[PDB]
Design a protein around this nucleic acid. Structure first.
Lengths: 98, 124, 155, 78, 60, 127, 24
RNA sequence: CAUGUGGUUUAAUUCGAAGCAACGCGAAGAACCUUACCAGGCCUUGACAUGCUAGGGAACCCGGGUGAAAGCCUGGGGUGCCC
RNA sequence: AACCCCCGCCGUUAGUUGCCAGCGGUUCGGCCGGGCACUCUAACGGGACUGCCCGCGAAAGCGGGAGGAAGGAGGGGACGACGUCUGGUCAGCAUGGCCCUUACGGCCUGGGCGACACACGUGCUACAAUGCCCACUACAAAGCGAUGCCACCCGGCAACGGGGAGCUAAUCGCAAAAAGGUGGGCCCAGUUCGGAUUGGGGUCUGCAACCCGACCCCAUGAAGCCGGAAUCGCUAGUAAUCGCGGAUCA
């Protein structure tokens, strides 16, 4: 019944925040659809290196936002017990739906 | 095929033929061919005595059209010799009337280049 | 370039005659990267052959191209306060390239309004032995023999 | 063109309207070259600033749609 | 008119059309990004030091 | 019941399913020579089959997605041949001998700053 | 051609729609 | 025809860049903003910072007149504290 | 050079994108229950080292052959030594020194930056039939969106304008790519080629479009029939050609 959103700029801390809320959630009752990877949304920032004028030779970066999704089939008291309280987002972001 | 003043086309599809009138273009053309109901594909080469008169009737009676259309636009531009709107000059100085780069192009309104010129360096 | 002999890029055959020599010709017809328009012509012109000549277009085109290949030509060279056009042989690869190019250009100078017709007619003329593209062949070879004076600069 | 409205400045009309009250003479300075000439405003000569000085323009019926700056050149000799 | 201006940028006088952008570090008038509030230089300086989360050296 | 092989060429992807039958081939729910009609060239995708001697033997179902119509025709050519090598290890003495097994890693290269089109450098002045 | 604003490509090139290029 | 520059012009037509390696370059957005330029009206511890002295005022909120605006003149709601 | 990122081949992990791939019901829309085998998505791996064979060589390594998605730096990136040009920037900022402190500071209203007898650079649209015009019909990628992108209606020739559903966005929207394919018209003409210029009429942002905005409609249809001396780019998914998006931003 319950939909969860895991967004953030680092993938190694975002995949870890996912895999946790699965081992520590299956145990809690009805089972779960493991971390599923949404398309990354990228944002490019291009600009001329020099302060004055060399309108050719320049340099550019991005800002990538990777996502994942997880669906738990059924709301057991042992599940909403743990997850409703254990909020440990280091630089990760979350949203919840039903 | 003498419709307007001394204006006459031939051997071409009438939709196009009508074009060779001052104050008739693509649109005012096919607009007229429907209000007279005349197959555009037909050449001027072949069509009724009256088809032509009915055509002439519509066109000539309605809008205008060479001579006094031409003459209207001239007295328009004359009248912009009023107290002298910015657009009134530019028609006296024969320069563009609609906000444009004169320092370079503008050749369509100034007749061919007058190369009148000079600039130097220090010779020694 | 300066070290290796450069690469003789390999073609893939024709899908209607399985002839690599025919793709080569279609390439030279092609404008602005529009290979559909290109081969469409080539074939439409093969169709103009069949009507006005019960010959296999494949065989006409084959001869036409052969009849336009130039045996020899002139390549300028510097000797010392004098730039002579020295005459010499032609690579078989080079023979092909040119003959095809000349055919296509010969074609486009003709006065027939649609294309294929031109390419057809010009191919017919060439194989019969007398087109714009052959005058060109002839001309080039006349420049040799005339400058055979300096043929002893075969570089 | 502004198609709902006539965008003409108020500080101008005040001085035209109270001057319409018996139509007085008209030494009238302005900075509203961005404003229209309104129907009937004939006789009323308005001195228009063009960046540099106030050009005493006089008014006639034929000119009406046109703005004030459209009779007050900002530049000298082409 | 450098100081008097960066301060004029903050206030919003008559007619909201006048409200221009302006860099935060640099009093920069041109080349000013909605996302970061910064100039092209101001930005590039930072990006190299890590003061901007997840803004990495691109490469494709 | 079936043979399968995957094919892709330059931002274009094709799925090849085969069934021993008469000949007829449908793709995105359409006859082959209706989707690729006019493109007098498409008809090349089928050449891997003419190198096994069996074209009258199968009835392929294919779905192709993305890129551009000619790139797609190359992708089919890859999947058709990649399906039959599975259903015959001894059909490797026609596939590898011709170019039918490889992918075509040739791809549109990246537009670079200071140029117009990745390689066309802009026009020189000096004066 | 691409600067004839009374055609298909005149409108496409410009980036606009109108009578001569029907909206949608 | 669009755009950058030389030049002349102008009340001003703001400054920079100068073979390659300046010239659709600072400029990845000039109608007022921008905006560094000119003409015309105004303002001085100032549009912004740090600290001191002095009676009022010690937060704040709404209009009037004049003017092109800026500005300058000017009518009303009135303060939860250490105690 | 190597370690780092993007494209290529295959695996492992995960299923609101995908799938009659297989039976299932379908108002025929993967719409539906069902299902991760395909496709994709994004995260961790395997794979290539001149390791195998033949020849040349003292060696390094060169040429040639097989297996292989791929070899001899496999294709693109990021990365640029001690130094050179008293190179560029005091106008992004920082900063020594110099100079002004009812003004060389500060505020507004109007102008100017957009001037035009001329001269050069970078560009756009072309002079046409391998073309132009009209109707219908296909196949992308990377990105972007709450006083934002707008489905779908209704009116207007249209620009646009009244209504109003979905959306924090692989679940709705920009959105049609275009060249192409098909069939209808032009018939070699300064033309149904070419769209400059000026007249007339409108819309939208904005306090305000005279100097100075963008679009839409009618009418005007200029020069150009391939360019003197000269002069630029590019070695492969490159040149050529076609359209799409984004920063800035009323």
């Amino acid at each position: 019944k319950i939909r969860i959103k895991l967004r953030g700029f680092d993938h190694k801390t975002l995949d870890a925040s996912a895999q946790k809320i699965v081992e520590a959630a299956r145990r809690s009752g009805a089972q779960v659809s493991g971390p599923i990877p949404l398309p990354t949304r990228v944002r490019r920032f291009t600009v001329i290196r020099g302060p004055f004028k060399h309108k050719d030779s320049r340099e550019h970066f991005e800002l990538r936002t990777h996502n994942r999704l997880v669906d738990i089939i059924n709301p057991n008291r042992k599940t909403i017990e743990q997850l409703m309280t254990l909020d440990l987002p280091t630089g990760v972001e979350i949203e919840i739906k039903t | 095929a003498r419709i307007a003043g001394v204006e006459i086309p031939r051997n071409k599809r009438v939709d196009v033929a009508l074009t060779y009138i001052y104050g008739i273009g693509k649109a005012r053309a096919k607009e007229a061919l429907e209000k007279t109901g005349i197959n555009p594909a037909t050449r001027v080469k072949d069509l009724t005595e009256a088809e032509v008169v009915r055509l002439r009737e519509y066109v000539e009676n309605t809008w205008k059209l060479e001579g006094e259309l031409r003459a209207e636009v001239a007295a328009n531009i004359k009248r912009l010799m009023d107290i002298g709107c910015y657009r009134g000059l530019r028609h006296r100085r024969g320069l563009p009337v609609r906000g444009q780069r004169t320092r370079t192009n503008a050749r369509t309104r100034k007749g061919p280049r007058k190369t009148v010129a000079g600039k130097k360096k220090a010779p020694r | 370039a300066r070290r290796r002999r450069a690469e003789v890029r390999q073609l893939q055959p024709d899908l209607v005659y399985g002839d690599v020599l025919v793709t080569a010709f279609i390439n030279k017809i092609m404008r602005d990267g529009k290979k559909n328009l290109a081969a469409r012509i080539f074939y439409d012109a093969c169709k103009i052959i069949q009507e006005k000549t019960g010959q296999e277009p494949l065989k006409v085109f084959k001869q036409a191209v052969e009849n336009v290949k130039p045996r020899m030509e002139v390549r300028s060279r510097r000797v010392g306060g004098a730039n002579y056009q020295v005459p010499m042989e032609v690579s078989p690869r080079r023979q092909q390239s040119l003959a095809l190019r000349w055919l296509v250009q010969a074609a486009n100078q003709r006065p027939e309004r649609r294309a294929a017709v031109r390419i057809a007619h010009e191919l017919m003329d060439a194989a019969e032995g007398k087109g714009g593209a052959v005058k060109k062949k002839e001309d080039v070879e006349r420049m040799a023999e005339a400058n055979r004076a300096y043929a002893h600069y075969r570089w | 063109s502004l198609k709902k409205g006539v965008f003409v400045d108020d500080h101008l009309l005040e001085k035209v309207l109270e001057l319409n009250a018996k139509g007085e003479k008209r030494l009238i300075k302005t900075w509203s070259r961005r404003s229209t000439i309104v129907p009937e405003m004939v006789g009323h000569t308005i001195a228009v600033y063009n960046g540099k000085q106030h050009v005493p323009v006089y008014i006639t019926e034929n000119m009406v749609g046109h703005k004030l700056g459209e009779f007050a050149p900002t530049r000298t000799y082409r | 008119a450098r100081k008097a201006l960066i301060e004029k940028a903050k206030r919003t006088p008559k007619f909201k059309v006048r409200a221009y952008t302006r860099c935060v570090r640099c009093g920069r008038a041109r080349s000013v990004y909605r996302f970061f509030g910064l100039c092209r230089i101001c930005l590039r300086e930072l990006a190299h030091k890590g003061q901007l989360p997840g803004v990495r050296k691109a490469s494709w | 019941e079936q043979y399968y092989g995957t094919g892709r060429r330059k931002e274009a992807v094709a799925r090849v399913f085969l069934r021993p039958g008469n000949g007829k081939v449908t793709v995105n729910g359409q006859d082959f020579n209706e989707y690729f009609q006019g493109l007098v060239r498409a008809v090349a995708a089928l050449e891997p089959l003419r190198a096994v001697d069996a074209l009258g033997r199968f009835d392929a179902y294919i779905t192709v997605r993305g890129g551009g119509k000619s790139g797609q025709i190359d992708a089919i050519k890859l999947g058709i041949a990649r399906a039959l090598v599975q259903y015959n290890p001894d059909y490797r003495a026609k596939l590898k001998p011709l170019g039918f097994l490889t992918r075509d890693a040739r791809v549109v290269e990246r537009k670079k700053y200071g140029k117009h089109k990745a390689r066309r450098a802009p026009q020189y002045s000096k004066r | 051609g691409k600067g004839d604003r009374r055609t298909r490509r005149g409108k496409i090139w410009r980036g606009t729609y109108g009578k001569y290029r029907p909206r949608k």
